[PDB]
Design a protein around this ligand. Structure first.
Ligand code: HEM
Ligand code: HEM
Ligand code: HEM
Ligand code: HEM
Lengths: 142, 136, 136, 142
């Protein structure tokens, strides 16, 4: 669970990072697809499932919007993300093992764009935060 | 494992422009701060400790050894595997964790050059190297 | 991978006393129930569904295949591997799950004859088999 | 997280299985040490650490004592196992990766002993319960 130091760590980082949220979501989502082909299935209904693609660029905005939401509801991720859990488990039926993957890709992207910002200390708290998000999202699977 | 010429080029490119004294220490410091339980293997702030910096360097050199023998990787590490396994008491899981840290530190070094294709090659290489290490 | 005669002996012995029409459906039934998300590959009750029962049996017959080719596993499943990924779009994590379910069901039938040694050999087998499946 | 039905399933099961707790802990501890050698080191301070051993047998009792505890504190595992967590982290310094391993062995043994009561339904709930237990034990590591 996140401590006060963790919650503060994430808010401080997010305030420097938030402006590039859409860049991060697109790059991250592109990487995931290329590096972990197994995740290409879920976006197969899109015409262009490649790095440039307008759908990827569009969806990346939404994924980061979800993260922005998680940041606001940090004190209670489970209830803040209930609906999204519901949606991924029943409507999209997204295998839960993939949340670990995307989280990894986002950390890499943030590292790529904010190397001076992403210190080991920020890293620990952001990883704890992202795990909690992954955990909140699996809530409604079983 | 199957390697393509492209992958051979990319990994060779990465390791020939890498600065071991910088990446090594940073990658180990991060792992010990992000995954605190690995710290029990250095029973004697973490980012400044010379003994940590030292093994960090050793790790990267140990990898470099694998870059030269991309086709005979399992044999190449058999010994180092036993070292960590039988004597140091390393949980195989700790290798996969260090693996991620090395990737993250490298990404912050190469910035926009750490393209998705480069990530793919670098991760696949660490994968094979981690299996070998957590097999004996 | 390395195999000891003792292991070859248990894995072989385990599969000859096993009734496939029995273990197959129960192992798959359980996996579909304990890990609900794998059910989306059989959308085209669970414990009584014949389609699930049938694939459970096919699973055991495919494992039996690798028992006959212990020193040639990765090659023995290359065809099955591409089917579950290329066409079926089964997440490789799912093999890990079904693996545990088979162990648990088998453990309930062999009772106390399912010793820690038997367990170790049988898990090692599935580990290798799962690697060849989620690899391609 | 555990639902009302998940909680009643675990209690119902524990009510039947509880009497063999000591036997379950001994067998489960033996399998872990054997099937996953990497875990032997934490118990090297014991003279004899083999299936039959009296130390394994004594410790299999405390482990199951811990499960019985979690069962009681099932409404809030995090605060209920704050102690065991603090202990395995700073005192014993056990790698958190191993809790899933012990959980798996406990499941196997229960199938071995109570095949008739360990139904798929019981399995779902006991599994979520053990994931919760492992999660709470990992609580004080970072
Ligand atoms: C960091 C965790 C994640 C967040 C915050 C997130 C967020 C979202 C959001 C906000 C939507 C919105 C669609 C709408 O407007 O209703 C969505 C859709 C979707 N998500 Fe996720 N998601 C996450 C992880 C994943 C993963 C790991 C996958 C699978 C590789 C996935 C697959 C999908 C799919 C397939 C859709 C439907 C897209 C479409 O057809 O438009 N998501 N997600
Ligand atoms: C990326 C995989 C790794 C590689 C390639 C690697 C490589 C090496 C090498 C080359 C040595 C020196 C050998 C000698 O003195 O004979 C060494 C020592 C050691 N390694 Fe690693 N290692 C790796 C991962 C780890 C991990 C994950 C840990 C646990 C934090 C670890 C803990 C140790 C310890 C405790 C020593 C002895 C310390 C010392 O240098 O005095 N290593 N390693
Ligand atoms: C333990 C590893 C597994 C083995 C050895 C195995 C084996 C097989 C075989 C032999 C077929 C028959 C295809 C044909 O007629 O050519 C098949 C089909 C299929 N498998 Fe698997 N499988 C395994 C795991 C899985 C998993 C984990 C899933 C996801 C729950 C899955 C889902 C399917 C589906 C949807 C089909 C096609 C339907 C059918 O013909 O029954 N399989 N599998
Ligand atoms: C189902 C999760 C687990 C529970 C509920 C549990 C519970 C306990 C309890 C109750 C103690 C007794 C100490 C005392 O009263 O002060 C203990 C000690 C210990 N545990 Fe665990 N444990 C779990 C998992 C593990 C794992 C996975 C490992 C190692 C791979 C481990 C290693 C140890 C060691 C080495 C000791 C000290 C033994 C001794 O010298 O007496 N535990 N544990």
């Amino acid at each position: 669970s996140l401590s006060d130091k963790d919650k503060a760590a994430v808010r401080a980082l997010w305030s420097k990072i938030g402006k590039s949220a859409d860049a991060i979501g697109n790059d991250a989502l592109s990487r995931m697809i290329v590096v972990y082909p197994q995740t290409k299935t879920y976006f197969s209904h899109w015409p262009d499932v490649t790095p440039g693609s307008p759908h990827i660029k569009a969806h990346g905005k939404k994924v980061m919007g979800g993260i922005a939401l998680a940041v606001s509801k940090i004190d209670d991720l489970k209830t803040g993300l209930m609906e999204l859990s519901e949606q991924h488990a029943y409507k999209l039926r997204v295998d839960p093992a993939n949340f670990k993957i995307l989280n990894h890709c986002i950390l890499v992207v943030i590292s790529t764009m904010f190397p001076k910002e992403f210190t080991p200390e920020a890293h620990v708290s952001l990883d704890k935060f992202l795990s909690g998000v992954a955990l909140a999202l699996a809530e409604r699977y079983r | 494992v199957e390697w393509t010429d492209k992958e051979r080029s990319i990994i060779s490119d990465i390791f020939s422009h890498m600065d071991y004294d910088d990446i090594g220490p940073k990658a180990l410091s991060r792992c010990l701060i992000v995954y605190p339980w690995t710290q029990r293997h250095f029973s004697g702030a973490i980012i400044g400790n010379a003994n940590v910096a030292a093994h960090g360097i050793k790790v990267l050199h140990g990898l470099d050894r694998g870059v030269k023998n991309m086709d005979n990787i399992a044999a190449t590490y058999a010994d180092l595997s036993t070292l960590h396994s039988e004597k140091l008491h390393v949980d195989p899981d700790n290798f996969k964790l260090l693996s991620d840290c090395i990737t993250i530190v490298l990404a912050a070094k190469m910035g926009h050059a750490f393209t998705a294709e480069t990530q793919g090659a670098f991760q696949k290489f660490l994968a094979v190297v981690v299996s070998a290490l957590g097999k004996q």
